[PDB]
Design a protein around this ligand. Structure first.
Ligand SMILES: CCOP(=O)(OCC)Oc1ccc(OC)cc1
Ligand SMILES: CCOP(=O)(OCC)Oc1ccc(OC)cc1
Ligand SMILES: [Co+2]
Ligand SMILES: [Co+2]
Ligand SMILES: [Co+2]
Ligand SMILES: [Co+2]
Lengths: 329, 329
């Protein structure tokens, strides 16, 4: 069942979401960029084909649904998402909200104006497509800027009006989740509607269990990110960090071992094009992780099983938690 | 004729440009914004109708051509420009380049990459439309940021490869034109291919004649901008300044009186929608200047005539200078 989630191909039953990656991208870009300069990615056709191959690989590994958390300012192209979703037979949930690169036409807006924008994308549809967002993505990088405070409040308001969940980018090492939580709660948003993302970028379990104890979903969503072996590459070092995937994966077990199995969401933060960072970062990433969005089911899940995590628990994390999170509530 | 300029409706003879406003906008926005949130402007249809009425008014006052200097990051919508150009029977020259709000997908690019982007828009067409840019717009606001240095170099390179002119946003009070000139000349660009814009935002004739003596076009392009009478409106004060239109217009006469009649370009920097600033700034502007893009021919040109500027000189400034500037050279 009955409960429904909006995808780029229309409504689906919550129970058909199945194994769901909750923080992913088809393409990390900027508003209007794919339209104005598709050759940056070879071509739009090349980008789409690459995404379809990647999604088919994830599907073969058991992934049924991804949540593409690309906002307006990540250059979300909902037609692209629909095309690749259809071709790969993988459900894609699209996002509204704002990441940390909003243009002036967004930065000048009030909380009321931002709320109306997020509601448009959830309730009416994105652009002129009728495709509705199933999640609201927001971001801080350290202490929230004044504008980011408005974005988080607008996200809370839009979530409260629609039941659609909120998911966040954090600077995990700066413990952004604490302020994000304070702002969301100041708007009366339930922690169960919120995922504090990039939380596997830190090993601070005091911070992570603090959030989980409050009922937040903890997004351990950068599983394959490691610059181990690439320390000479400064841009890769800065973005990927120096912790292994096994170290990140251990956080899943750490939270389960501390009673928080129902508070965990697991993902890759992968993409098939990436224009908002250094040129050729996509080639570096594809070398680090050729499995792409199949990495979680192929490497992380078996690692956890071998460490003694029961299959029912792993099913709970990868199927039940996303279903509960995405189901408008 | 023989010489041709690209417009949003295709090629036109340079000699048909006629009375040309060289720094104008249909809509001041952000990449992807009109597509994602047209209701911000009432609707796309309302925006277009308003622009057509405004352009018809300018046309009735003798304006034949405007140069819409909206870049990618000003949210240039070339289909919108074509629609309103066709309906109003006013030629519109579109722009490539970058203003001061580029997203990360632009900010991360090298001079070589930016050059390729500007050349795409000039030589191939904007997005998938085949509409070609006839000018390159760039911006500093004080000393150039490192990225802005690259943008100015890329603009110079694209201009050199295509003959298409470069036009700039400055913070005039900070005399940005001097550094902009230094950067352009460092790339071997001819000053005659360059307009240093917003130059009527200052009365520093040492600065202005310094540029004109070097062969730069001096863009006196904010003619109707004044917050006189609106001093209680902080956002209007900051954007419009406290100098009268007559004070701005006097700069046209000052430069003519100093032998620089052939170095002057005159415009309004007007628009019919404006999302990159405070909400309702468009209503404030329409109250200050209901004549819109007819203000120059209706008010400025007669003011100059009454101050003794001969009609042939005024024709030279409003017709001959833009023709020479826009003609690829
Ligand atoms: C790689 C993961 O990034 P994210 O999920 O982006 C996809 C939308 O949240 C970058 C980080 C820093 C940058 O430089 C300022 C640019 C992009
Ligand atoms: C009004 C004239 O602006 P411009 O021609 O813009 C149209 C593209 O070159 C604004 C100035 C400051 C702002 O705040 C940071 C926003 C817009
Ligand atoms: Co992020
Ligand atoms: Co992400
Ligand atoms: Co400007
Ligand atoms: Co302008």
């Amino acid at each position: 069942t009955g409960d429904l989630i909006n995808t780029v191909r229309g409504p689906i039953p919550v129970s058909e979401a199945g194994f769901t990656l909750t923080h992913e991208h088809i393409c990390g870009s900027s508003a209007g960029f794919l339209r104005a300069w598709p050759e940056f990615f070879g071509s739009r056709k090349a980008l789409a084909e690459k995404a379809v191959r990647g999604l088919r690989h994830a599907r073969s590994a058991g992934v049924q649904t991804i949540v593409d958390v690309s906002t307006f300012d990540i250059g979300r192209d909902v037609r692209l998402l629909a095309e690749v979703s259809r071709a790969a037979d993988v459900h894609i949930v699209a996002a509204t909200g704002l990441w940390f690169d909003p243009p002036l036409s967004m930065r000048m807006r009030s909380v009321e104006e931002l709320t109306q924008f997020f509601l448009r994308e959830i309730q009416h549809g994105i652009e002129d497509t009728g495709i509705r967002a199933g999640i609201i993505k927001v971001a801080t990088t350290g202490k929230a800027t004044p504008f980011q405070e408005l974005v988080l409040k607008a996200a809370a308001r839009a979530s409260l009006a629609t039941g659609v969940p909120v998911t966040t980018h954090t600077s995990a090492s700066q413990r952004d989740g604490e302020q994000q939580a304070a702002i969301f709660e100041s708007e009366g948003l339930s922690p169960s509607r919120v995922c504090i993302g990039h939380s596997d970028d830190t090993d601070d379990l005091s911070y992570l269990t603090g959030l989980a104890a409050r009922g937040y979903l903890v997004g351990l969503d950068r599983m394959p990110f490691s610059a181990i072996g690439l320390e000479g590459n400064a841009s890769a070092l800065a973005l990927f960090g120096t912790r292994s995937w096994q170290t990140r994966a251990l956080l899943i077990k750490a939270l389960i071992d501390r009673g928080y199995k129902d508070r965990i969401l697991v993902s890759h933060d992968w993409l098939f094009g990436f224009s908002s960072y250094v040129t050729n970062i996509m080639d570096v990433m594809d070398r680090i992780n050729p499995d792409g969005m199949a990495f979680v089911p192929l490497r992380v899940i078996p690692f956890l099983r071998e460490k003694g995590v029961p299959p029912e628990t792993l099913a709970g994390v990868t199927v039940a938690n996303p279903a509960r999170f995405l189901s408008p509530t």
